[PDB]
Design an enzyme around this catalytic site. Sequence first.
Site, PDB file in Angstrom:
ATOM      1  N   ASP A 293     -13.945  21.720 -28.595  1.00 23.46           N
ATOM      2  CA  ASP A 293     -12.537  21.426 -28.350  1.00 23.46           C
ATOM      3  C   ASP A 293     -12.368  19.969 -27.928  1.00 23.46           C
ATOM      4  O   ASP A 293     -11.590  19.649 -27.025  1.00 23.46           O
ATOM      5  CB  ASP A 293     -11.962  22.395 -27.314  1.00 23.46           C
TER       6      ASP A 293
ATOM      7  N   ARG B  93      -6.578  15.415 -25.166  1.00 19.13           N
ATOM      8  CA  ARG B  93      -6.077  16.255 -24.080  1.00 19.13           C
ATOM      9  C   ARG B  93      -7.192  16.754 -23.162  1.00 19.13           C
ATOM     10  O   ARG B  93      -6.903  17.151 -22.027  1.00 19.13           O
ATOM     11  CB  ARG B  93      -5.276  17.439 -24.632  1.00 19.13           C
ATOM     12  N   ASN B  94      -8.450  16.750 -23.619  1.00 18.22           N
ATOM     13  CA  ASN B  94      -9.581  17.217 -22.822  1.00 18.22           C
ATOM     14  C   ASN B  94     -10.457  16.079 -22.310  1.00 18.22           C
ATOM     15  O   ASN B  94     -11.603  16.309 -21.905  1.00 18.22           O
ATOM     16  CB  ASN B  94     -10.394  18.238 -23.612  1.00 18.22           C
TER      17      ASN B  94
ATOM     18  N   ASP C  77     -13.426  20.028 -19.817  1.00 21.44           N
ATOM     19  CA  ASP C  77     -13.164  21.355 -20.415  1.00 21.44           C
ATOM     20  C   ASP C  77     -14.435  22.036 -20.936  1.00 21.44           C
ATOM     21  O   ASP C  77     -14.669  22.036 -22.055  1.00 21.44           O
ATOM     22  CB  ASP C  77     -12.006  21.309 -21.438  1.00 21.44           C
TER      23      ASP C  77
HETATM   24  C1  LIG Z   1     -11.118  20.860 -10.738  1.00 23.29           C
HETATM   25  C2  LIG Z   1     -11.679  21.098 -11.991  1.00 23.29           C
HETATM   26  C3  LIG Z   1     -12.301  22.323 -12.220  1.00 23.29           C
HETATM   27  C4  LIG Z   1     -12.874  22.600 -13.457  1.00 23.29           C
HETATM   28  C5  LIG Z   1     -12.831  21.642 -14.466  1.00 23.29           C
HETATM   29  C6  LIG Z   1     -12.214  20.412 -14.240  1.00 23.29           C
HETATM   30 CL1  LIG Z   1     -12.197  19.277 -15.502  1.00 23.29          CL
HETATM   31  C7  LIG Z   1     -11.625  20.138 -13.006  1.00 23.29           C
HETATM   32  N1  LIG Z   1     -11.033  18.927 -12.772  1.00 23.29           N
HETATM   33  C8  LIG Z   1      -9.796  18.640 -13.280  1.00 23.29           C
HETATM   34  O1  LIG Z   1      -9.133  19.463 -13.910  1.00 23.29           O
HETATM   35  C9  LIG Z   1      -9.244  17.431 -13.005  1.00 23.29           C
HETATM   36  C10 LIG Z   1      -9.834  16.349 -12.454  1.00 23.29           C
HETATM   37  N2  LIG Z   1      -9.017  15.278 -12.274  1.00 23.29           N
HETATM   38  C11 LIG Z   1      -7.745  15.456 -12.661  1.00 23.29           C
HETATM   39  N3  LIG Z   1      -6.825  14.476 -12.523  1.00 23.29           N
HETATM   40  C12 LIG Z   1      -5.550  14.563 -12.935  1.00 23.29           C
HETATM   41  C13 LIG Z   1      -4.552  13.917 -12.208  1.00 23.29           C
HETATM   42  C14 LIG Z   1      -3.225  13.983 -12.635  1.00 23.29           C
HETATM   43  C15 LIG Z   1      -2.867  14.669 -13.797  1.00 23.29           C
HETATM   44  C16 LIG Z   1      -3.872  15.290 -14.530  1.00 23.29           C
HETATM   45  C17 LIG Z   1      -3.694  16.010 -15.697  1.00 23.29           C
HETATM   46  O2  LIG Z   1      -3.183  15.526 -16.710  1.00 23.29           O
HETATM   47  N4  LIG Z   1      -4.283  17.203 -15.579  1.00 23.29           N
HETATM   48  C18 LIG Z   1      -4.404  18.268 -16.571  1.00 23.29           C
HETATM   49  C19 LIG Z   1      -3.111  18.517 -17.311  1.00 23.29           C
HETATM   50  C20 LIG Z   1      -3.307  19.724 -18.211  1.00 23.29           C
HETATM   51  N5  LIG Z   1      -3.648  20.917 -17.417  1.00 23.29           N
HETATM   52  C21 LIG Z   1      -4.901  20.693 -16.677  1.00 23.29           C
HETATM   53  C22 LIG Z   1      -4.765  19.495 -15.760  1.00 23.29           C
HETATM   54  F1  LIG Z   1      -5.885  19.252 -15.088  1.00 23.29           F
HETATM   55  F2  LIG Z   1      -3.815  19.708 -14.834  1.00 23.29           F
HETATM   56  C23 LIG Z   1      -5.185  15.233 -14.089  1.00 23.29           C
HETATM   57  S1  LIG Z   1      -7.599  17.044 -13.285  1.00 23.29           S
END
Ligand SMILES: Cc1cccc(Cl)c1NC(=O)c1cnc(Nc2cccc(C(=O)N[C@@H]3CCNCC3(F)F)c2)s1
Length: 290
Positions: free
Chosen positions: A133, A137-138, A151
């Site tokens: 994927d 977006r990822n 992701d």
């Molecule tokens: C916390 C966590 C657990 C498992 C996998 C992952 Cl990859 C993560 N970490 C994250 O999702 C993130 C780490 N840093 C992030 N920063 C951030 C700050 C502001 C906005 C966004 C953003 O666009 N986030 C995406 C939007 C789509 N839905 C998932 C999201 F993370 F909210 C991300 S999200």
Amino acid sequence: VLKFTTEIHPSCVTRQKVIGAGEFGEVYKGMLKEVPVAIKTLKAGYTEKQRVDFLGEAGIMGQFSHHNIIRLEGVISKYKPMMIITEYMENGALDKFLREKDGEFSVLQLVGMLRGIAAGMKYLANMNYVHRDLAARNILVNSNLVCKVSDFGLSRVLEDDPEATYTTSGGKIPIRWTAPEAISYRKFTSASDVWSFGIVMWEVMTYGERPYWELSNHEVMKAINDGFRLPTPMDCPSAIYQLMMQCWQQERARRPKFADIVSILDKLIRAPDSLKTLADFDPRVSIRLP
Ligand SMILES: Cc1cccc(Cl)c1NC(=O)c1cnc(Nc2cccc(C(=O)N[C@@H]3CCNCC3(F)F)c2)s1
């Protein structure tokens, strides 16, 4: 794999702002006892499958140590709700970031983003991890403009992504990012990830244009099978368009490996005048003035 993971006590974690959401949990920006983190929760009543998929993402992330792969800080598994805690990427998802920053970066900066993504993907491929994927977006972006692949998991990756749709023969797939052999016969490999990376290259160079615009999924598959490919972005270095075009070879064996992609991008960046030669852009509008 969870034994590699740090178990974090809930009292060290403060959820502050909601940044992502779903039906079975949310993603938060927060602080970890004094550093910013992202925090993903899993709500009570989760199934066994949900628990295995959720903790499985952390288990996979904990096996990786690379500058261009999202870093795991730890998990909360002994208390509820369960949580996965990672580094906090200040600029969020790359697709939305580019669309909100249209025209704000240099060509060199854009190509540097692609080199980082390619380095993360080379690492994953060589660790025997097929992403399935890969798409802007990822990818997540930090305050140093570093792009990191995110992701991770097994079935949860394509199941959770709304861009992945049910095909005619079964297989929930994000069609316009996916290589022909993965669509046609479910063959997902690092070489289908290379096809996806070519799409990511086009997403970056266009500041987040949607691949194939308003063509339907069937129209995209038909166009690709007939030999059509995405046209050059505006202001795109010739070398960069040539590279993305080679990622979209129908014959899987003809595509570059990520090792090749990283090498080429590194050479272009180290001789940055090479990026001044632009591929011709086919204008979709004619403006004529006397
Ligand atoms: C916390 C966590 C657990 C498992 C996998 C992952 Cl990859 C993560 N970490 C994250 O999702 C993130 C780490 N840093 C992030 N920063 C951030 C700050 C502001 C906005 C966004 C953003 O666009 N986030 C995406 C939007 C789509 N839905 C998932 C999201 F993370 F909210 C991300 S999200």
